[PDB]
């Protein structure tokens, strides 16, 4: 199960032989590994990567002080990529091949305290025809005496977005070796600058 740390840098169109492909260029550069798990130590046996460089003065040293591999500590979240196993130095893009289906797991855009019509795609009341204040309200939220209480998960307003979102079955278009970039087929979760992990899709 191949995977990588990446960051969205924007999206555009590429041109194939006949059809244009809505690619997302994504910067999954050289990722230093810092720690390997073990079945005899923790069991689940994952591998811990970290990707983007940090100057050694903003660190606080429970973090500064990892051993020989990746002495220069990275910035972002040291993600473990779930039974992937590299050789030991770094993970480049050439682990991936063009024509493979890759999963992208990132962090989507939080819309704030988003509404119920924008959040759960309701319909609401009409604008005309006497409607007092129902133009964006959800409406009825239950029943009278039996059952009484409102059920759990009634799909009302709250914090829509800003959660870890996985978009799946993305085919690899092109690989850029000199800057270590990837070109997925659109619809990556996350903004311009949102870190993702890119695994292998199954879909066997």
């Amino acid at each position: 199960m191949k995977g990588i740390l990446g960051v969205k840098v924007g999206m555009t169109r590429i041109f194939r032989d006949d059809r244009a492909v809505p690619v997302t260029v994504i910067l999954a550069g050289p990722c230093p590994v810092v720690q390997r798990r073990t079945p005899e130590k923790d069991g689940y046996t994952a591998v811990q990567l970290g990707f983007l460089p940090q100057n050694p003065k903003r660190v606080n040293r429970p973090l500064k002080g990892h051993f020989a591999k990746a002495g220069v500590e990275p910035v972002r979240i040291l993600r473990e990529i779930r039974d992937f196993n590299p050789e030991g130095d770094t993970v480049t893009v050439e682990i991936f091949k063009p024509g493979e289906r890759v999963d992208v797991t990132g962090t989507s855009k939080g819309r704030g305290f988003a509404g119920v019509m924008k959040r759960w795609n309701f319909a609401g009341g009409p604008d005309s025809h006497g409607a007092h204040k129902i133009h964006r309200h959800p409406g009825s939220i239950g029943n009278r005496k039996t059952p009484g209480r409102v059920y759990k998960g009634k799909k009302m307003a709250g914090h829509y977005g800003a959660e870890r979102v996985t978009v799946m079955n993305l085919e690899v278009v092109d690989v850029i070796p000199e800057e270590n970039l990837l070109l997925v087929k659109g619809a990556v979760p996350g903004p311009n600058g949102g870190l993702v992990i890119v695994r292998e899709t199954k879909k066997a």
Binding site: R13, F15, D18, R19
Partner: protein, 122 residues
């Protein structure tokens, strides 16, 4: 992208001039209708001496929309007005001269006799 209660303009010479479509044949709840899509239309106004009278419930295929057709190479195309061609129940046009331009998706979606009949296919 034509909907119920839409006045398609007939680009055929079957007598009908302007029709109003109701139900799109795609499945359970066909919301829209692209170009190359069989619809059911009632004939509002017609020219005389034609086999298609007023109030006939006929089938048709949509050949021109004001909303774009998105070609798969990234390119797209729009038209000036909504148009339809009076098809029968066995997917054959009742008229032997279709007016104006049509699209290219009629070819890859089955219809050859319409596209071969259209003078300037876009």
């Amino acid at each position: 992208m034509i909907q119920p209660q839409t006045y398609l303009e007939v680009a055929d010479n079957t007598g009908a001039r302007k029709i109003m479509c109701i139900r799109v044949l795609k499945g359970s709840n066909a919301k829209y209708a692209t170009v190359g899509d069989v619809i059911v239309a009632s004939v509002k106004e017609a020219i005389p001496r034609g086999a298609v009278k007023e109030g006939d419930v006929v089938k048709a295929v949509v050949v021109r929309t004001k909303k774009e057709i998105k070609r798969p190479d990234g390119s797209a195309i729009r038209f000036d007005d909504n148009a339809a061609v009076i098809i029968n129940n066995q997917l054959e046009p009742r008229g032997t001269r279709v007016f104006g331009p049509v699209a290219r998706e009629l070819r890859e979606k089955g219809f050859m006799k319409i596209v071969s009949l259209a003078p300037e296919v876009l």
